Amino acid sequence: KISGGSVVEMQGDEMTRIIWELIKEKLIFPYVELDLHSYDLGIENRDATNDQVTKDAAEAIKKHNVGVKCATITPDEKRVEEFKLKQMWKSPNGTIRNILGGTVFREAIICKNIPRVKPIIIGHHATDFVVPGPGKVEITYTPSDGTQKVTYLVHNFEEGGGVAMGMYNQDKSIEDFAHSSFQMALSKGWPLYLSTKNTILKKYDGRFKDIFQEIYDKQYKSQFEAQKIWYEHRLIDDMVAQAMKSEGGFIWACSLGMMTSVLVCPDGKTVEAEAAHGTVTRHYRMYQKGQETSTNPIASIFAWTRGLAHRAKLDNNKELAFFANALEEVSIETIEAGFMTKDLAACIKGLPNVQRSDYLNTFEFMDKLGENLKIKLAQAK
């Protein structure tokens, strides 16, 4: 078996919990041995430990660089009542993000037989108050050296009351955004585009464009030209214009079962992968009632494969990297071959025309991925 390494695993809730254990059992463990740092982020254990499993998991990701997370219930009122929660805990994704930092990149997985060639990887990057009555709401900046004092008028209230707010943004955040954007662009080998309003908010987004150019020229221009890739700034409307008439395959800096979300830290060494969808509670209820479900596992599978690909990149693990690539291959090939779940069958033929004989249920699709994975790993090597 392949020697994997140190990987932080986080288990989730409901249907994604089931698919998680299936993915490991039938796809991961039979071929890879891992120094696994498992953390049970189910809602009942998060309640029992008072989100301490969440904090611990986040710090463990900070130590071992690579994390793979399953979808976990985010509690609201009906959740607190359902599980008898001691408190309405904050989102574990929120906690982990507030401990690790970084920027989130969402990539959709494109099959050549599903209605939509190269995927677009989209990455996204305050004092409010009431104002009782008429008056002057100004915003003033005073440098630390006291050289000047600049005061702008947000609005002069003469009609009556209202509401106001002020926002800020330091340079280091924009520099981290550009860092992770260029690193992701070089890791995938696809060009990078930055889209902003830039004209409406003249001063605000122009800073983003400028910092992106400074970092690109002082660090990445050479390596980009050395990989048939580049960076370029555009505006939102023109970005949609060229986008709706392009082959695809670029990092744009601004069925759900196929969306993959990955948090990339600015230092470039720490990465957390997770499906972009939720716990699929409706299908989990169908599973509780003994009915037949059909949940696409591709998003969580790709969380595992991207996490393993990053672990392999860190450990110089050629075998494990080949394994992750092989599993992604088996997935896209299995769907393109015709075997898929009901959601993809609906994306193709439209819901009211979906016959049963057009899709497989969750366990059948997992079995098919297992067969094709064993075949692929035996023949491709």
Ligand X SMILES: NC(=O)c1ccc[n+]([C@@H]2O[C@H](COP(=O)([O-])OP(=O)(O)OC[C@H]3O[C@@H](n4cnc5c(N)ncnc54)[C@H](OP(=O)(O)O)[C@@H]3O)[C@@H](O)[C@H]2O)c1
> Could you tell me the smallest distance in angstroms from the CB atom of residue 91 to ligand 42W?
3
d(CA 4, CA 33): 5
Q: Is 173 one of the binding residues for ligand 42W (CB under 6 A)?
A: no
Query: What does the DSSP assignment read for 308-353?
Result: HHHHHHHHT-HHHHHHHHHHHHHHHHHHHTT---HHHHHHHH-GGG
Q: Is 120 one of the binding residues for ligand X (CB under 6 A)?
A: no
Q: Which among 180, 183, 178 is positioned nearest to 229, based on CA atoms? A: 183
For the chain, the residue count is: 381
Contact between 35 and 5 (Cβ < 8 Å): yes
Total of residues contacting ligand 42W (CB under 6 A)? 7
Tell me the per-residue interface mask from 60 to 89 with ligand 42W, x by CB under 6 A, - otherwise. --------------x---------------
Determine which residue in the list 48, 50, 81, 94 makes contact with ligand 42W, applying CB under 6 A.
94
Question: How are beta strands 150-157 and 32-40 bridged, if at all?
Answer: unpaired
Q: Is 11 one of the binding residues for ligand X (CB under 6 A)?
A: no
Q: Is 97 one of the binding residues for ligand 42W (CB under 6 A)?
A: yes
**Which segment (91-99, 157-165, 167-175, 295-303) binds ligand 42W by CB under 6 A?**
91-99
For residue 294, how many C-alpha atoms fall within 13 Å in the half-sphere facing its CB?
15
Q: Residue 48 or residue 351: which is nearer to a copy of itself going by CB? A: 351
Q: Residue 139 or residue 256: which is nearer to ligand X going by CB? A: 256
Contact between 233 and 193 (Cβ < 8 Å): yes
Place of tokens 């280091």: 172
How far apart, in Å, are the Cα atoms of 100 and each of 93, 255, 268? 10, 29, 12
> Could you tell me the smallest distance in angstroms from the CB atom of residue 250 to a copy of itself?
20
| Nearest residue to ligand X, by Cβ distance, number only | 278
Restricting to residues 222-241, name those near ligand X by CB under 6 A: 241
> Could you tell me the smallest distance in angstroms from the CB atom of residue 116 to ligand X?
16
Q: Which does 98 bind (CB under 5 to 8 A by kind): ligand X, ligand 42W, a copy of itself, none?
A: ligand 42W
> 10 Å Cβ neighbour count for 76?
11
* Partner residues linked to 150 by β-bridges: 141
Determine which residue in the list 139, 154, 165, 256 makes contact with ligand X, applying CB under 6 A.
256
Q: Is 176 one of the binding residues for ligand X (CB under 6 A)?
A: no
Determine which residue in the list 93, 181, 260, 317 makes contact with ligand 42W, applying CB under 6 A.
93
Tell me the three state secondary structure of residue 296.
coil
Restricting to residues 323-362, name those near ligand X by CB under 6 A: 343
DSSP state of 242: H
> Could you tell me the smallest distance in angstroms from the CB atom of residue 79 to ligand 42W?
10
How far apart, in Å, are the Cα atoms of 236 and each of 21, 118, 214, 220, 252? 41, 20, 21, 23, 10
d(CA 286, CA 289): 5
Tell me the three state secondary structure of residue 16.
helix
Q: Which does 256 bind (CB under 5 to 8 A by kind): a copy of itself, ligand X, ligand 42W, none?
A: ligand X
> Could you tell me the smallest distance in angstroms from the CB atom of residue 177 to a copy of itself?
13
Which chain residues interact with ligand X by CB under 6 A? Answer: 12, 69, 71-74, 93, 241, 244-245, 256-257, 274, 277-283, 295-296, 299, 343
Which chain residues interact with ligand 42W by CB under 6 A? Answer: 74, 90-91, 93-94, 97-98
